[PDB]
Amino acid sequence: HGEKSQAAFMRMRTIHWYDLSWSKEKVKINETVEIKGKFHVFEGWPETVDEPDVAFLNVGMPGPVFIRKESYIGGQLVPRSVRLEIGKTYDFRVVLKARRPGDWHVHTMMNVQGGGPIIGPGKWITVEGSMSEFRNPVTTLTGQTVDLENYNEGNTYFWHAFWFAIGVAWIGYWSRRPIFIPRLLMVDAGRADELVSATDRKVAMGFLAATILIVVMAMSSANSKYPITIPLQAGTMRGMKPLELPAPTVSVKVEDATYRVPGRAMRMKLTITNHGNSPIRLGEFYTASVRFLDSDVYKDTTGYPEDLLAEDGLSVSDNSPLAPGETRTVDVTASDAAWEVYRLSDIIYDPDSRFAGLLFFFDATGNRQVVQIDAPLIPSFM
Amino acid sequence: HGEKSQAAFMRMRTIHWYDLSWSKEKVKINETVEIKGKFHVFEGWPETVDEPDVAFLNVGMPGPVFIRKESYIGGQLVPRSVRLEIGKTYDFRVVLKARRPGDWHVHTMMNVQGGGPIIGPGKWITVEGSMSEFRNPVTTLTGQTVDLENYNEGNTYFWHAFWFAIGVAWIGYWSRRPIFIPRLLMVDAGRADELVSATDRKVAMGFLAATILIVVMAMSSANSKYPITIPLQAGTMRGMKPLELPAPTVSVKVEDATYRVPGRAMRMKLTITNHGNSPIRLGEFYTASVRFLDSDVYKDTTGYPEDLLAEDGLSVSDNSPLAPGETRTVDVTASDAAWEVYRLSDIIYDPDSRFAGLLFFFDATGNRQVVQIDAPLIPSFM
Amino acid sequence: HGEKSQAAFMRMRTIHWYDLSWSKEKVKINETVEIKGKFHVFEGWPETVDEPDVAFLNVGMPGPVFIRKESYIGGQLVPRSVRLEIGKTYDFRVVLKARRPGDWHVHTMMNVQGGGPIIGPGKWITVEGSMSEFRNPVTTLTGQTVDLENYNEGNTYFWHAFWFAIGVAWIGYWSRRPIFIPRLLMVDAGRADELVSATDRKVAMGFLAATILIVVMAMSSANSKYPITIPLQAGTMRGMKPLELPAPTVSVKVEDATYRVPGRAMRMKLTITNHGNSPIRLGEFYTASVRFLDSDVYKDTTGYPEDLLAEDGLSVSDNSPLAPGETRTVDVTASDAAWEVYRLSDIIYDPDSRFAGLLFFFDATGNRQVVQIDAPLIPSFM
Ligand SMILES: CCCCCCC/C=C/CCCCCCCC(=O)OC[C@H](COP(=O)(O)OCCN)OC(=O)CCCCCCCCCCCCCCC
Ligand SMILES: CCCCCCC/C=C/CCCCCCCC(=O)OC[C@H](COP(=O)(O)OCCN)OC(=O)CCCCCCCCCCCCCCC
Ligand SMILES: CCCCCCC/C=C/CCCCCCCC(=O)OC[C@H](COP(=O)(O)OCCN)OC(=O)CCCCCCCCCCCCCCC
Ligand SMILES: CCCCCCC/C=C/CCCCCCCC(=O)OC[C@H](COP(=O)(O)OCCN)OC(=O)CCCCCCCCCCCCCCC
Ligand SMILES: CCCCCCC/C=C/CCCCCCCC(=O)OC[C@H](COP(=O)(O)OCCN)OC(=O)CCCCCCCCCCCCCCC
Ligand SMILES: CCCCCCC/C=C/CCCCCCCC(=O)OC[C@H](COP(=O)(O)OCCN)OC(=O)CCCCCCCCCCCCCCC
Ligand SMILES: CCCCCCC/C=C\CCCCCCCC(=O)OC[C@H](COP(=O)(O)OCCN)OC(=O)CCCCCCCCCCCCCCC
Ligand SMILES: CCCCCCC/C=C\CCCCCCCC(=O)OC[C@H](COP(=O)(O)OCCN)OC(=O)CCCCCCCCCCCCCCC
Ligand SMILES: CCCCCCC/C=C\CCCCCCCC(=O)OC[C@H](COP(=O)(O)OCCN)OC(=O)CCCCCCCCCCCCCCC
Ligand SMILES: [Cu+2]
Ligand SMILES: [Cu+2]
Ligand SMILES: [Cu+2]
Ligand SMILES: [Cu+2]
Ligand SMILES: [Cu+2]
Ligand SMILES: [Cu+2]
Missing domain, CATH: 2.60.120.570 (Particulate methane monooxygenase, b subunit. Chain: A, domain 1)
Known part of the structure; x- marks a missing residue:
């Protein structure tokens, strides 16, 4: 998707x-x-x-x-x-x-x-x-086998809950007294120094010292528990x-390539020269995940997604054995609802109306050559 | 230029x-x-x-x-x-x-x-x-032939004049009254609310609604007139x-390359090895659009800009047939006013005193080989 | 260092x-x-x-x-x-x-x-x-031989001292009078205009004119003394x-590469194929400026820094002539204090535990082939 x-x-x-x-x-x-x-x-x-x-x-x-x-x-x-x-x-x-x-x-x-x-x-x-x-079992270099689905979950929960509880306790220590209005009035009246006592200062000092000491001890304990660590x-x-x-013993030149804009198909004039590899025949045109095939030359047996497979979407004017050396100009027509379903017809909104794809040629023995074609695509409106 | x-x-x-x-x-x-x-x-x-x-x-x-x-x-x-x-x-x-x-x-x-x-x-x-x-005739895919010199000129003039007239009318509606001094005094005096009436508010509302409606209608009409458009x-x-x-069957090494700074010429020592292609001879040195030629070996017949063509600006110490295999060290002198006219002598102000150019070698049959040379250029002042 | x-x-x-x-x-x-x-x-x-x-x-x-x-x-x-x-x-x-x-x-x-x-x-x-x-003698294109150790030193000293003396004189002209407190009080009292006299204005005008004229004359004199200059x-x-x-007629594949983390060595399993060049033998492994050699196959005679030369730091399970075509899997062990001295053992802190190095193969006649190997390096802790 x-x-x-x-x-x-x-x-x-x-x-x-x-x-x-x-x-x-x-x-x-x-x-x-x-x-x-x-x-x-x-x-x-x-x-x-x-x-x-x-x-x-x-x-x-x-x-x-x-x-x-x-x-x-x-x-x-x-x-x-x-x-x-x-x-x-x-x-x-x-x-x-x-x-x-x-x-x-x-x-x-x-x-x-x-x-x-x-x-x-x-x-x-x-x-x-x-x-x-x-x-999801994984064996570490330290000799431990763990399950990645639940590994280190409890430790993370414990540490996060511990620090959240410490913060909640710090807030709730001050939350037992009037919070907003009386304190604001006292600060406005100039009695701010009365809002913090010596016991509060001692509690703050204890909180700071305990936080630092706990962090240091936790780091030391984690280092002791896992003495072998590596960075990411x-x-x-x-x-x-x-x-x-x-290299393709087959040469293909794209004379013209056009598509009707209403349109569910694409048409192209191609000049094909066989440079050996026995009489060949076009069997498939691949554009954008869509494969247009000529049933008489080739049949897919790989379970290619059917929404993208056009078993008879390749129509070649003359698809007869192209004798090695023959230079035939043929009119190929790639037609299928996938052209419209996969929005390939939206090339009309593109700031570059040029296409590229793959052509597959098969001989009598079944050997396959891949030829790579690219051309500008001209919309037809008449 | x-x-x-x-x-x-x-x-x-x-x-x-x-x-x-x-x-x-x-x-x-x-x-x-x-x-x-x-x-x-x-x-x-x-x-x-x-x-x-x-x-x-x-x-x-x-x-x-x-x-x-x-x-x-x-x-x-x-x-x-x-x-x-x-x-x-x-x-x-x-x-x-x-x-x-x-x-x-x-x-x-x-x-x-x-x-x-x-x-x-x-x-x-x-x-x-x-x-x-x-x-400048151009035929579109919609079947219309237009002249690009005057195409769409009247439409642009009409729309720009229309919107300019609307703006001028908007300004002139308020311009019929005292503008600057009495209004400033009234605003300073606190009588700003008296400067805008209900009729003015209705006129502003009508202007806004008409502008929006006209823009929408014009866009719809333009879309209807030209239903087929593509982006840039x-x-x-x-x-x-x-x-x-x-590849050049001729090998050329630049021993030294110097130019007198007062100077309208350039001199270079070259070692040339013929790797076949029959006895050859240097006929031309191309530097920066300037072609120095050896009249006895080659003559231009292409109408090369004369200000850039030195018909006898190539002086080779020994320009005799370089038998295939001969390794001759020759002193070539490229001289012409173009060196000073095209300010090639301003290499003295350059933060990089290195040159590059092309050498053309011709055999008895007239076949041409192109050799590419690059070296540092040393100014001579003594 | x-x-x-x-x-x-x-x-x-x-x-x-x-x-x-x-x-x-x-x-x-x-x-x-x-x-x-x-x-x-x-x-x-x-x-x-x-x-x-x-x-x-x-x-x-x-x-x-x-x-x-x-x-x-x-x-x-x-x-x-x-x-x-x-x-x-x-x-x-x-x-x-x-x-x-x-x-x-x-x-x-x-x-x-x-x-x-x-x-x-x-x-x-x-x-x-x-x-x-x-x-450090250097001969210039103008025909002058200079020593770069002391060239232009006196001129720089003279000009810097001259301009520093001018600035010091400018400051000291005003420094002969009370500086900070009386002037501040006079400015605060509104008597600032009394702190600068006509003579001071004339002195400032003379200083400005003399500075500009001296700069211009010095530039002209420098241009006259050195009429030929080039940019950097x-x-x-x-x-x-x-x-x-x-190209190495020898093919080497790295099956595994490991290092003990305490560790002063590195171990690797290698598959070696001889593609001709007579029976060959590994003589040296180069990693990071460190050369591990097999004394029986090769000996350095180039005065390679001894801190980086391990004369017998290459241990190959089977280092017998690898008959052209033989594909032997061998266990090589590169050991030396340089591994720890040059901190190559610090690959344990690296965000990428992959190594690369060079292997040198020698035949009976002494011809040397260089093979390039790269693999991931796995630390061993057990
Ligand atoms: C779940 C709450 C939402 C978010 C909490 C975020 C941060 C915490 C804020 C308040 C913490 C201190 C509690 C108040 C002082 C806790 C406190 O002082 O309790 C005694 C209060 C005050 O005594 P009083 O003046 O005589 O009575 C006035 C209220 N009746 O009395 C009570 O009866 C209890 C009321 C307080 C209960 C609030 C607790 C909720 C906060 C804990 C949530 C923990 C979970 C966090 C993530 C959501
Ligand atoms: C690397 C250099 C250090 C950074 C420089 C700043 C250091 C500041 C020092 C204090 C200067 C202010 C004057 C206070 C005089 C000594 C002093 O610490 O007094 C307590 C002050 C409050 O000031 P005072 O009472 O008016 O000071 C007069 C004499 N007591 O509170 C604090 O310093 C903060 C709360 C108490 C500190 C207890 C320790 C907890 C915090 C540190 C962590 C300790 C645990 C370590 C874990 C292993
Ligand atoms: C060509 C002008 C230069 C640039 C114009 C730029 C924007 C427009 C500004 C003014 C438009 C409203 C006109 C004034 C209220 C138009 C207006 O109110 O006209 C009646 C005025 C005012 O009546 P009053 O108070 O009894 O008389 C005082 C002046 N005599 O009387 C007049 O006799 C007419 C004077 C006004 C003529 C100015 C018109 C020029 C502006 C139109 C130019 C259009 C071309 C634009 C591009 C250059
Ligand atoms: C997508 C959400 C829309 C954006 C949100 C803001 C919208 C604002 C609404 C008005 C709130 C203010 C209270 C006014 C109450 C209704 C209202 O529109 O009143 C007229 C107000 C002046 O306020 P008031 O008289 O004191 O309001 C009291 C009751 N009338 O003027 C305006 O709204 C502007 C001038 C009149 C508008 C006429 C339409 C022209 C402008 C829109 C284009 C219409 C044509 C479309 C072309 C197809
Ligand atoms: C070496 C000094 C450090 C840095 C200098 C930096 C910039 C220069 C500042 C002061 C220059 C003007 C001198 C004062 C007015 C020079 C001045 O007015 O001298 C007469 C003073 C003033 O007369 P008074 O009011 O009757 O006496 C008060 C002081 N006794 O009397 C003196 O006896 C001389 C005192 C002044 C000596 C200071 C000179 C040091 C500055 C020159 C250093 C040059 C080297 C520069 C690089 C380090
Ligand atoms: C490219 C355009 C030039 C930049 C524009 C600004 C130029 C300013 C001109 C002065 C306008 C202010 C009115 C002064 C009227 C003429 C004038 O120059 O007066 C002296 C003014 C002080 O003003 P004033 O006496 O009240 O003026 C009334 C009539 N004198 O001081 C100065 O101009 C500065 C100090 C004296 C200048 C002497 C020359 C030294 C500085 C220039 C270098 C000359 C040597 C060249 C080396 C080759
Ligand atoms: C998630 C786990 C939650 C942890 C909860 C920790 C408890 C937090 C706060 C306790 C508030 C008590 C305040 C009593 C002052 C209440 C108070 O101020 O009482 C008067 C005392 C008089 O003491 P005195 O004997 O006359 O003088 C000192 C020497 N004798 O003054 C004080 O200064 C007493 C200071 C006591 C402060 C204790 C706070 C320390 C809290 C650290 C918590 C550590 C975190 C947990 C570790 C795992
Ligand atoms: C380039 C082309 C130029 C276009 C020129 C457009 C004309 C512009 C402004 C006309 C000003 C007249 C103001 C009269 C108020 C003059 C005014 O205020 O008169 C009192 C009326 C009394 O009307 P009433 O009947 O008692 O109450 C309303 C219902 N009956 O009050 C008002 O509120 C009248 C409002 C009339 C406002 C008309 C302005 C609309 C202009 C839109 C122009 C469209 C653009 C062109 C389209 C192609
Ligand atoms: C590193 C080398 C150090 C260079 C040292 C230069 C000396 C600097 C300052 C001298 C201060 C004297 C001030 C006398 C005013 C002392 C002063 O103001 O005396 C009253 C005169 C009266 O003169 P008067 O005749 O009645 O009128 C003018 C025509 N006759 O007024 C003035 O206006 C006199 C102006 C004289 C100013 C001379 C300063 C020029 C200094 C330029 C130095 C050049 C740099 C060196 C070149 C290599
Ligand atoms: Cu999907
Ligand atoms: Cu491709
Ligand atoms: Cu030009
Ligand atoms: Cu070139
Ligand atoms: Cu060093
Ligand atoms: Cu390398």
Whole structure:
């Protein structure tokens, strides 16, 4: 939730999430779900979004209904912010543990500093069980195993209640006497010195000394109880390993790209050159989490969110085997209610009417090439 | 105009504009002139100029004597700011349309954010005709063809005059009575409440209600008249395609570079190694829009501004065919009044006495290699 | 001095200084000492240190006990700040001239803007002689040879004394009369106009006119005496040539890296793959200026500061010739008091417990390969 309201061109021109898998659709409490996939950083990064020099891989959900057990970018655990390079592709994996029952829309997201949220496709996952069964065991380097759900709760309650009680006692010591009107009149009359006695001064001295001594003793006792402590671990982790992918033996030029403004579709003229890899055929156009597929060339079998999957939303004028070398100019039409449901038609309000997306080409043997396209998008009103 | 006053080293060390062409020297009104060429970004970019992450290709002229019909960087239209990389070469093309008659010095420039203006060579172009004949037709996506010279002029005049008249009427309603002295005396005397009557309150209420209602009705009518509107299109366009140029089979090392301070020339010792490409010969040294040529090796036939063209300003101790492999140390002398006219001799006031420029080598067949040189420049006073 | 107090991980993860040489250990006054070596910029640059876009090569010493005659980065003199790239290796050379007698700990350092100091290994150098024998001759472009120790000293003294005397005379002219109490009483009584006479006004006018005229005449005389002047030369020098080094035919993966917190050592599990270059053997681990060596494989003969040299501080479970192709998992133990002396054990207070260092592999013929390792460092308390 939160993507439909984001500018259409910003969603089109930031990060592209390609083949994704979810290990389970329905999980029990304390069971783990794995979300893997690839994300590509668009070369034409918008200028109002800072470069992903400081980026964090996040899980979009209405709260800690899951707990993120681990997250890996390129096989490396990423508990901190990371640095990503423009134009590179990265594998990502996220292992989550179920905490609260219910149906949850879970998304993979990249939070970018100086940019904001970049939400990926969301999937509905059902958690069955009771929240009281959730456990979060962690073993420390000191040899102690604790449960993070209730660890250190009683100590915090005790100390906060103790200090609150001390403050309440300090206020109530003075609250046993007339408070506001008689004291104000006495101060106005010049009898302020009569409002504080020697016993009050001794009580204040005792309160101050007891507070300081208790703080010192509590710090000493806490140090004795936990002689081994480390500061909070923070920093930006550089040197993320990107994917070394086969360059596309397929070249695609966008002649024109238009959308009818009333409109639930997008149309584009494309010149495609096959540089080998056998006769190929376009099977899918990915724009903003929406996948328009050509049923005759490719069929999704990964449980891609159906609200974002158009099984026959790709209409190519001529989708015949493009013999290696053939340069065919084709008119592709990407049509689906998701265009209007995911407010991609709101590119009419955007201060930049340019789109970007991914095209997937398959040969007879099923090998897939990914081609990256970007162009300006012209609205049609006649 | 405006380059002679810019620091000599800043002009030497930012952008180099090489082979340029102008389609016409004399044009009529509404006729188009094309300026094409190449620009190279110097690797040793000055630190006080921000990197050209946000750069705009501009035309330097005393105003809209021309209108910039289009501009292309690497074959791509660039109506917005673009991103350029240090050390890369780009083709550029600018098509301008003549608007005002007269002789105009036209320059191609790169405005760089956090840096300032980078002016290129200027050429004198004559426009013959009358300004009243200039037309700027534009066809909109709604099917309307308009002339940008006078489009929406009458509407703006009408609305501004209407609101100015309303304000004048509001002031003049109160201006029919004594204004300053009697009213001031009455306010001082305590008779302020007598200065505003019930009729005045009713008039003020009517003015407020009429203003609000007129604004609302005008907005509704404007929306009805123009139901299709888009916001201003802005942004920085990345992914500019640079030139893939042959690396210079010629290696040049600058041993020493000196200039006499009184002085109208510059001298340099150079070690040149030919790595193939047949016997070569130096034909031209480009510094800051100034081209020093060796008449025996090369002759300009592009109409390069004569104030910046020194046909025999390159004197090479030995400019004989440098057999592939020969490593000759030569003393080159670049001499021309342009050195003093374009204030390149003002490098003596610069906080950085280092120069950069381009050397052009030609073989027997006429093939040209471009070598890029940079060194510190030492003034000579004895 | 000043490195032991710097965070251990910051010292481990910034710049690595490898093979270094000092021309002399004991020098006389006016004699020169050359310090050469290589420095590598770590790929995982810490986020709190700005990238070395503006870096200066500096000499760490308690003052001008030496004078830095020259400094070269990649064979190019670097009197100004320079730009360095992450992940590149550079040669550096520094020629210093002895000025003051005594024993001096001299370090090579890289000052990085927005980062702070990066100190390298320090060496003790003895200077014998008298400071009065030190000379700093410099020949100017005007044909004058001067000594920078005493040049322009007398002129500065004369002008400062002259202006101080003028100010003292101005104060003392008024100081001959009663100063504070009688004048205050007269001003309070309304007799302020009697405290300044016409002669005082004439004296003030003469002082003002003489000051302005003297300033103008002094400027004119200084211009006449030195008709050739240049501004201060400043700027950041880009285009530093890095080393083109053989990629390591040796691959090393860090399985685990741990240190006992009481502790004077560090332990690591490593998987090493030989990709040719004959049977190899680990001979040295460099962490933070500390070099742990395996005496049986390599011996230092460069006079590396002994406080930072552990001749037998590298213990490899199996350090037998790793036949090209062999993938052996070995347990290496780097032990030395320098770990505690140079406060590398203070990584326990660091907000980032990750280390980086260099491994040196030698074959039978003595050829050396450098492998770069980085991992998180886990403290052991049991
Ligand atoms: C829950 C209260 C709201 C917020 C409290 C915030 C800070 C505390 C303020 C007052 C503390 C001192 C009590 C008054 C002097 C406590 C005090 O003096 O009590 C005797 C009073 C005074 O004697 P008197 O002049 O002969 O009688 C006048 C009132 N009948 O008599 C009483 O019968 C008791 C009345 C006082 C009861 C108020 C207690 C509520 C405060 C404790 C709340 C603790 C929880 C805090 C978080 C919400
Ligand atoms: C690092 C330097 C210290 C900071 C400088 C200021 C220090 C001030 C000193 C007092 C100067 C004022 C004159 C008072 C003369 C001595 C003095 O302390 O008198 C009591 C004064 C009231 O002043 P007075 O009676 O008119 O003074 C005349 C002689 N008694 O109250 C206080 O000082 C505050 C309340 C009583 C203090 C008891 C200790 C509790 C507070 C400290 C914590 C102790 C427990 C430590 C935990 C381990
Ligand atoms: C061009 C004027 C300069 C700038 C104007 C700026 C804002 C407007 C100020 C005054 C408007 C109300 C007029 C006075 C009450 C208009 C008004 O009350 O006119 C009757 C006056 C007053 O009657 P009275 O007391 O019996 O006579 C005294 C003056 N003789 O009599 C007149 O004979 C007319 C004199 C007033 C003429 C001034 C008009 C100029 C202002 C309009 C300019 C519009 C263009 C604006 C942009 C420049
Ligand atoms: C979103 C919330 C609204 C903002 C809150 C403030 C609103 C204020 C309300 C009035 C409170 C003061 C008491 C007045 C009582 C009602 C009232 O409006 O009285 C007239 C008052 C003068 O006060 P009064 O006579 O002593 O009031 C006693 C009873 N009449 O003048 C005004 O309110 C201003 C001039 C007359 C207003 C006429 C409408 C023109 C202005 C609004 C635009 C209407 C056209 C819309 C275009 C589509
Ligand atoms: C070294 C002094 C410290 C700093 C000086 C800073 C600025 C100068 C202040 C005073 C200058 C005017 C002198 C007084 C009027 C100089 C002056 O009027 O001298 C005659 C006085 C006054 O005559 P009187 O009323 O009959 O006698 C009263 C004092 N006996 O008599 C004297 O016997 C001389 C006393 C004055 C000597 C003070 C001189 C010190 C200042 C010069 C220092 C220069 C070095 C500067 C850097 C440190
Ligand atoms: C660029 C524009 C200049 C700045 C504008 C202000 C200039 C001010 C002028 C004076 C106006 C006040 C009326 C005084 C009338 C003329 C005048 O200068 O009178 C003397 C006034 C005192 O005023 P007054 O006697 O009541 O004036 C009545 C007629 N004399 O003192 C001063 O002006 C200051 C002290 C005397 C000046 C002598 C010259 C020394 C200062 C300047 C440097 C000269 C040497 C140059 C070196 C090459
Ligand atoms: C959450 C836990 C709540 C803690 C509650 C603590 C109690 C707080 C205040 C008690 C007020 C009694 C005032 C009696 C003066 C009532 C009073 O003033 O009585 C006259 C005495 C006469 O004493 P004397 O013998 O003639 O002279 C002194 C030596 N003999 O004067 C005084 O000066 C008596 C001073 C006594 C002050 C006691 C207050 C100390 C409170 C510290 C509390 C510590 C916090 C808890 C620790 C875990
Ligand atoms: C650029 C175009 C210029 C537009 C010029 C607009 C004219 C402006 C002001 C007229 C002043 C007349 C004042 C008469 C009070 C003169 C006045 O006060 O007369 C006494 C009346 C008595 O009226 P009554 O009948 O006894 O009671 C009300 C119901 N019957 O009192 C009032 O309260 C009369 C109020 C009348 C106010 C009229 C002003 C409205 C002006 C709106 C202009 C709209 C803008 C143009 C639209 C395109
Ligand atoms: C470090 C070097 C130190 C320099 C010391 C300079 C001496 C400073 C002040 C002298 C005070 C004498 C005051 C006499 C008034 C004492 C005074 O006021 O005497 C009455 C005269 C009467 O003169 P008169 O003839 O009747 O009228 C004028 C034409 N004839 O009035 C005046 O107005 C006299 C004005 C004389 C002022 C002289 C002060 C000039 C000082 C400039 C110094 C230059 C700096 C050094 C250059 C290298
Ligand atoms: Cu959602
Ligand atoms: Cu992409
Ligand atoms: Cu010009
Ligand atoms: Cu260049
Ligand atoms: Cu030291
Ligand atoms: Cu390194």
